[PDB]
Design an enzyme around this catalytic site. Structure first.
Site, PDB file in Angstrom:
ATOM      1  N   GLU A  53     -11.902   7.125   2.516  1.00 56.68           N
ATOM      2  CA  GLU A  53     -12.031   6.833   1.085  1.00 56.68           C
ATOM      3  C   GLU A  53     -13.370   7.313   0.515  1.00 56.68           C
ATOM      4  OE1 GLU A  53     -11.125   2.735   0.516  1.00 56.68           O
ATOM      5  OE2 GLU A  53      -8.946   3.052   0.625  1.00 56.68           O
ATOM      6  N   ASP A 113       0.824  -1.205   0.000  1.00 56.51           N
ATOM      7  CA  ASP A 113       0.000   0.000   0.000  1.00 56.51           C
ATOM      8  C   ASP A 113       0.859   1.256   0.000  1.00 56.51           C
ATOM      9  OD1 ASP A 113      -2.627  -1.004  -0.119  1.00 56.51           O
ATOM     10  OD2 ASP A 113      -2.698  -1.323   2.069  1.00 56.51           O
ATOM     11  N   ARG A 153     -14.648  -9.428  -3.176  1.00 53.08           N
ATOM     12  CA  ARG A 153     -14.691  -8.259  -4.053  1.00 53.08           C
ATOM     13  C   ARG A 153     -14.861  -8.714  -5.505  1.00 53.08           C
ATOM     14  NH1 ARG A 153      -9.765  -4.576  -1.569  1.00 53.08           N
ATOM     15  NH2 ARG A 153     -10.825  -4.089   0.413  1.00 53.08           N
ATOM     16  N   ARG A 201     -16.164   4.809   3.161  1.00 53.43           N
ATOM     17  CA  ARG A 201     -15.894   3.469   3.646  1.00 53.43           C
ATOM     18  C   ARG A 201     -15.750   3.519   5.159  1.00 53.43           C
ATOM     19  NH1 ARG A 201     -10.673   0.067   1.683  1.00 53.43           N
ATOM     20  NH2 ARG A 201     -10.559  -1.536   3.316  1.00 53.43           N
ATOM     21  N   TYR A 218     -12.253  -1.231  -6.018  1.00 52.93           N
ATOM     22  CA  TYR A 218     -12.777   0.100  -5.766  1.00 52.93           C
ATOM     23  C   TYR A 218     -13.681   0.546  -6.913  1.00 52.93           C
ATOM     24  CZ  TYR A 218      -9.495   0.884  -1.888  1.00 52.93           C
ATOM     25  OH  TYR A 218      -8.813   0.832  -0.695  1.00 52.93           O
TER      26      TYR A 218
HETATM   27  C1  G39 Z   1      -7.971   4.409   3.709  1.00 50.20           C
HETATM   28  C2  G39 Z   1      -8.120   2.907   3.847  1.00 50.20           C
HETATM   29  C3  G39 Z   1      -6.961   2.227   4.575  1.00 50.20           C
HETATM   30  C4  G39 Z   1      -5.839   3.139   5.047  1.00 50.20           C
HETATM   31  C5  G39 Z   1      -4.906   2.482   6.044  1.00 50.20           C
HETATM   32  O1  G39 Z   1      -6.424   1.116   3.816  1.00 50.20           O
HETATM   33  C6  G39 Z   1      -6.623   1.171   2.405  1.00 50.20           C
HETATM   34  C7  G39 Z   1      -7.216  -0.120   1.961  1.00 50.20           C
HETATM   35  C8  G39 Z   1      -6.961  -0.734   0.804  1.00 50.20           C
HETATM   36  C9  G39 Z   1      -7.753  -1.918   0.495  1.00 50.20           C
HETATM   37  O2  G39 Z   1      -8.587  -2.303   1.287  1.00 50.20           O
HETATM   38  O3  G39 Z   1      -7.579  -2.504  -0.548  1.00 50.20           O
HETATM   39  C10 G39 Z   1      -5.889  -0.234  -0.127  1.00 50.20           C
HETATM   40  C11 G39 Z   1      -5.461   1.219   0.158  1.00 50.20           C
HETATM   41  N1  G39 Z   1      -4.246   1.601  -0.580  1.00 50.20           N
HETATM   42  C12 G39 Z   1      -5.306   1.479   1.674  1.00 50.20           C
HETATM   43  N2  G39 Z   1      -4.874   2.845   1.910  1.00 50.20           N
HETATM   44  C13 G39 Z   1      -3.687   3.186   2.431  1.00 50.20           C
HETATM   45  C14 G39 Z   1      -3.446   4.653   2.628  1.00 50.20           C
HETATM   46  O4  G39 Z   1      -2.843   2.351   2.741  1.00 50.20           O
END
Ligand code: G39
Ligand code: G39
Ligand code: G39
Ligand code: G39
Ligand code: CA
Ligand code: CA
Ligand code: CA
Ligand code: CA
Lengths: 387, 387, 387, 387
Positions: free
Chosen positions: C197, C69, C290, C213, C324
């Protein structure tokens, strides 16, 4: 946007190396560098551009036939003067195995000759749009300058020729406004029998001139003199004992007007008028091989004087393989003259075919009675085995 | 468009990382990432641009000699601040093994030095056309800043120097409008003996300054101060006990005016004036090896006061290999100051030759008496074996 | 150029597939297709664009870590909505592992969050120039929408949040003109504990809204309602028995206001206001995986009514892996509404890492009480073995 | 910019070859040349452009299925008339397995048909934004022209059709201003039963015409005649004994009005009106196989007269494999007519799948009662084994 007017070239101090096209570096590196011949530089609507015919192939595994002059796959392409053919800056223009191009201040004018030897055809494009044509009149390889046309207040001019490449090749001059041929001039004069690959520069408000190739035994280049106002032209042989063509014998003093030379063949070379009184030209250093490229100048009338043209310097490593050369003129925003640059072709070949590098010198600095040159080194010994 | 006017930089709150140039990532990926050194950032006509010399080669199979400094294959190129050299954003500018560049609000001014060591030449281009030259005067590697020139009302200035890289290297200041050299100042002063690779920034409506490299044992940087109206300059050594060059000994209090240092060598470093009364600079974390890049600031006259500069933070992982650093200024429509960003070079090497990444920090946010720094991490363990 | 005003979205007849980004095709083909997550579409100054974070790598031999991520190599890039990331249309924007972007009618506004987890930083760029910043206030992964910000007469707005990804995540709303943060609003309300998000769309001249979310066990999406004139915002949980998040249990009727759900986790999903009275949203077809992406609409107030949202259709092959989704609005030159398009991510993985395709549906045709969908087929069985 | 007005094409002297798209050269070279079919030329906002559907793949290792007609991976792309699909000039437009496009003088109108066979949808984009749709009405492969739409004072028209590719396929004419469908005409007439792949050209200020494909045994082409002012159309079969479709029997005199032919199938072919009183068309040299492309002209009413059309020449090596052909018109600033060019597709296949080259002829020069044609040679023997 106004049309550029014909004006003299700027005098200066030194020929500096603005850029080189190291095609061979990218061939050896292994990228999709295209096989090109014969490259030169032309000032176009996007600025200074490297311009050349190509073959619709590229390294590292090029298709056969890159040493051919004419074929259905031949191409006219341009790219950045410090780029390489096939890189991000590359623009494909038209079908062509012979070409000219120039920029009149509003749009690019382009001549694209292709088709069969016995009936080839010039297609003229203005602004990206095909606008006119010219037909083969000798039925034997209609062909053109391979360098810039020349412009003035909307009229651009361009040499063409047609005829046996050993026998006569009676050339013609085209006068073109917005892509339309308005006038065609047959070029007569004591140096008109065989004229090709003219390199043409604007000399003053009302006159331009070209140094051409005579592919016959003659080593004295035909010079085409043209006038904008009357749209008229004439051809005479250069009289200076400094023989500019390749191949050629030793420099020697002979009566003006006549041909001179014993070695059939020829090579396109640059005409570099400096200001309103000075004439320079490039010639190979070797008398027979296309090696080296030295600049020769005189302040006298090279059509009327056998006085030798003094050597200003070596544009390039004198033992390096060279090739064609021609100049182009670039506006200077704050005075009445154009900067002049000369581009010399550096041919190379190998397992990936025939190809060429380019080097571009420009005359910069305050005016000097006699200028000098920065010699561009050409040394491929650290990568030539990959060519 | 109006000519940009010289104006103070904007104070702020924090140095944030605008973007990485991860050349190493693309070298290891296998694409045609070009080998670049001294990269930095400069605000050009396109906007912020990563700028560097290159070798006319690229991965994955680069040609030998990417470690060399001056060859006939060296060229100047620019690309996206968040891209990689060789990618879609890449632009080839000129032939150069030393360079400067800036944007006066209407056009890019570009300085390209190349040629032989004993007679190199600076070619000056403006808006894409060669406009002028400057010749070698010490006949020993004419060279220049490898970073932005500075501008004001159409006049842009650039440091050049000439002479042995250990002995005296008396520098000169060029003042250029539209590509034509209008004034040349020999820079004198107690810190002017050996001056090179100056990093210059507009300080105020009538002032700009540079922090330079002295390649002798001296570890105090020559600082150039210039006035726009008189087009006048002077060189003095920095006095603060915080020694800025690399290699250097420990920091120590010594009397102002004289050089001080124990290890020959040098490193181009950033001058970062902040508003009107504040001075920052970059230096390696390691005293001898080009490792890390920390930011030091003071509110006093670094040329007259011994006071230590206060470490503001680590731009970069402090054990990471770095290299050159220099700043550039970016117009701000909202107020009367420019944004200032510093670019630090991150040199790497390996099977694919010598090369460099780039990181770009910018000072943003509400003005603060003392600012902070986001430390950009540099960790190549997951892919370094492919380098 | 005028600033775009906030206006309603255009109603229509059918969701047609304007384009897809077939990243996986170019991965299997073997070109330098970049690993991207999480792509969506945003209307920018160059037109509609595909936008995503990337990793400064590409096929066919990508470097390790593409499933991460956050990392130092994370990237914000854009390209043609019918292109692929890494092709000719690709633009690198900034350093980022979290992002937003939008176009106010004159320039692009961009948020680039990067840096360490315990102190990350939002860098704001306007017009290609870094202009402002925002600091981490919870010291635990400052992060933003991963989709378009929203604009009106020069004020664009953008959600951010910060805090434990399982516990509370008190979000904030930024109001930004020419790249400067003018106002920051803490979002309170019965659905504000954990908001991230957010996918935000302009709804009418004075109001925009987002579906966010909730990464806690809650399956009811937080809805942020904001007003332009007062620059104020509030959060409430969706009350419709149609649970929009993933994972989730069965749809069921529960009293409004409270959280509902038993499965921790979450997924970003689109908010699609249609005209001034209709609300649509995307949800996965599978309750836990998903997979699939179906469009659900109601004409009632989803914050106040447990009435189910009717299914309009399947945007994509219902068993295909998705991810997404978010919408963006595009001007319609000849009426007072914006076309709305929804982009759904199609995640895939294999020997060349984690990556994503994109598909873009847009609502076109004359307005209809109930619209329909063209289902985009996602079937990689003829090339998946090369992924 | 002004809206382009409908105007007659320019007569001339000779059909010259403006450029080749040598896709096969680049496939064999090894670069990422994309697999394209029905390619043609269209004048767009950028200028003359090569336009085609593609498969989201390329050489040297293309994905399976390049021979298919309609898949979810089909897209519409454009590139340089002298480049190759996938090169630097390549632009991706939309998702499509059937398409049309044109430029009204202000913006590009683009029609993209995709979706399932039993319910495909035409998405209409204008200046880069989706603006409208048209739905399937026969539930059996809604489809369109694969060549330029035609324009006049902001109204551009486009043929679509629907229905079994052998049974009745009643076509429809769309009239579109700024991307919004303003009128739909069901085309009736004695030649309207099965009409597809119409090639349409402006004929005069108030008229345009199309020569279409009838995919039944019939070898007389349906000709569509439309009037701008009434936005009205009609379909009649061609009557001349010179049968234009492929496959066809021998030419023979038969009574006007009725279909005539012995072999089911069809081929899209060019309509080339020349000035106000002259009609030309293309057809294969071979009666049954898609080989060669000769140009036939008459000065009579092809819908009312049995007279043979006079073979003007061979556009192409007459044993070369060809394919689709269609024309486009290019503004001429000098007079009140448009230049007309014809593009002929040159299909090839091999180890790297199904693909096509393109050749583009344009009528230039002084008007002539009867014109000539430069025959573009197509010889792949030197590199075909790599295809
Ligand atoms: C804002 C949602 C959360 C932040 C920790 O996880 C997200 C989930 C994700 C996911 O569930 O697939 C991917 C995103 N890249 C990730 N965001 C960050 C900044 O790492
Ligand atoms: C105009 C010179 C003459 C024409 C037959 O030969 C030229 C000589 C060449 C040469 O001597 O190297 C290469 C040129 N490509 C060729 N031109 C054409 C049209 O083939
Ligand atoms: C020759 C003196 C010069 C200082 C200006 O050395 C520099 C030091 C360098 C260095 O210390 O890394 C690399 C530079 N590329 C080089 N510049 C040139 C022009 O060669
Ligand atoms: C399905 C009928 C249609 C005629 C319009 O067949 C065409 C014939 C083709 C052909 O004869 O080569 C190829 C075309 N790509 C195809 N068009 C579509 C939309 O599939
Ligand atoms: Ca000769
Ligand atoms: Ca030193
Ligand atoms: Ca949840
Ligand atoms: Ca038929």
């Amino acid at each position: 946007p106004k049309y550029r007017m014909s004006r003299p070239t700027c005098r200066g101090q030194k020929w500096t190396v603005m850029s080189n096209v190291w095609t061979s570096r990218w061939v050896a590196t292994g990228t999709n560098a295209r096989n090109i011949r014969p490259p030169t530089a032309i000032f176009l609507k996007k600025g200074l551009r490297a311009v050349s015919l190509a073959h619709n192939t590229a390294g590292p595994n090029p298709l056969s036939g890159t040493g051919s002059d004419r074929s259905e796959f031949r191409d006219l392409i341009t790219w950045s003067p410090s780029g390489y053919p096939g890189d991000e800056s590359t623009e494909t223009i038209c079908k062509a195995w012979s070409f000219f191009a120039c920029f009149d201040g509003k749009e690019d004018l382009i001549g694209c000759i292709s088709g069969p030897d016995n009936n080839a055809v010039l297609t003229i494009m203005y602004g990206g749009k095909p606008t006119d044509l010219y037909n083969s009149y000798a039925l034997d390889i209609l062909r053109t300058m391979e360098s810039q046309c020349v412009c003035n207040n909307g009229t651009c001019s361009a040499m063409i020729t047609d005829g046996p490449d050993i026998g006569p090749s009676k050339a013609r001059m085209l006068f073109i406004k917005e892509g339309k041929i308005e006038k065609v001039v047959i070029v007569d004069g004591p140096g008109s029998s065989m004229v090709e690959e003219c390199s043409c520069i604007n000399e003053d408000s009302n006159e331009f001139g070209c140094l051409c190739r005579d592919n016959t035994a003659n080593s004295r280049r035909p010079f085409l003199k043209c006038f904008w106002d009357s749209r008229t032209c004439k051809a005479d042989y250069t009289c200076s004992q400094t023989l500019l063509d390749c191949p050629r014998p030793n420099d020697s003093i002979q009566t003006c007007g006549t041909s001179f030379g014993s070695l059939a063949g020829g090579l396109k070379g640059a005409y570099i008028p400096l200001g309103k009184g000075r004439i320079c030209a490039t010639r190979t250093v070797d008398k027979i091989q296309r090696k080296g490229m030295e600049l020769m100048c005189t302040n006298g009338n090279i059509l009327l004087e056998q006085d030798a043209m003094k050597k200003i310097g070596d544009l390039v490593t004198p033992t390096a393989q060279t090739g064609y050369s021609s100049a182009t003129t670039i506006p200077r925003a704050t005075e009445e003259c154009d900067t002049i640059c000369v581009a010399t072709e550096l041919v190379f070949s190998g397992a990936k075919g025939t190809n060429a590098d380019l080097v571009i010198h420009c005359l910069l600095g305050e005016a000097r009675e006699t200028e000098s040159v920065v010699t561009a080194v050409v040394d491929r010994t650290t990568y030539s085995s990959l060519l």
